[PDB]
Amino acid sequence: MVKLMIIEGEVVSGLGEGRYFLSLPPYKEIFKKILGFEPYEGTLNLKLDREFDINKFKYIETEDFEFNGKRFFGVKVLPIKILIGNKKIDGAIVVPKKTYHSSEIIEIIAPMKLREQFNLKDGDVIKILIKGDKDE
Numbered sequence: 001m002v003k004l005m006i007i008e009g010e011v012v013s014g015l016g017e018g019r020y021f022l023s024l025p026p027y028k029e030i031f032k033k034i035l036g037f038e039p040y041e042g043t044l045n046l047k048l049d050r051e052f053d054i055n056k057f058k059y060i061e062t063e064d065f066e067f068n069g070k071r072f073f074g075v076k077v078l079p080i081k082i083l084i085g086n087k088k089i090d091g092a093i094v095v096p097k098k099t100y101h102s103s104e105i106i107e108i109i110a111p112m113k114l115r116e117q118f119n120l121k122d123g124d125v126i127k128i129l130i131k132g133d134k135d136e
Contacts, residue, residue: 003134009046009106011115011124018043026067029111034060034077035092039109044082044091045128046126051102053097054078057132061097073097081129082110084118088129 021027022041032038059078074097082091091110114120
């Protein structure tokens with residue numbers, strides 16, 4: 001048996017608050033290992049009406065690593081399925097390994113920029129599907 005959950009999120013603007021590089025090699029390598037593909041250089045930021053914590057579902061964690069003599073911090077990643085209109089595309093949610101409290105904001109990565117492919121504007125609503133399991 002498997003436990004499934006569905007949550008709704010609205011398109012919100014957010015990019016300057018997050019500061020990292022995707023074009024460099026090591027980011028594409030670690031993403032393709034966890035997801036099996038290299039995500040595009042961008043994010044989809046959704047605001048939810050409910051708090052979210054990746055430690056309530058089964059995610060994959062990656063340890064602290066170094067590249068070109070610089071230290072980068074470990075991160076947690078969990079696959080998702082993104083439903084917009086009548087189409088479903090594979091995506092994933094990304095959050096740093098270090099977390100203090102829980103929030104209602106999640107950032108997603110995808111194979112391509114969803115905002116262009118679906119002509120989506122800020123305020124529009126899309127549905128996210130999360131897979132999980134219960135020991136019972």
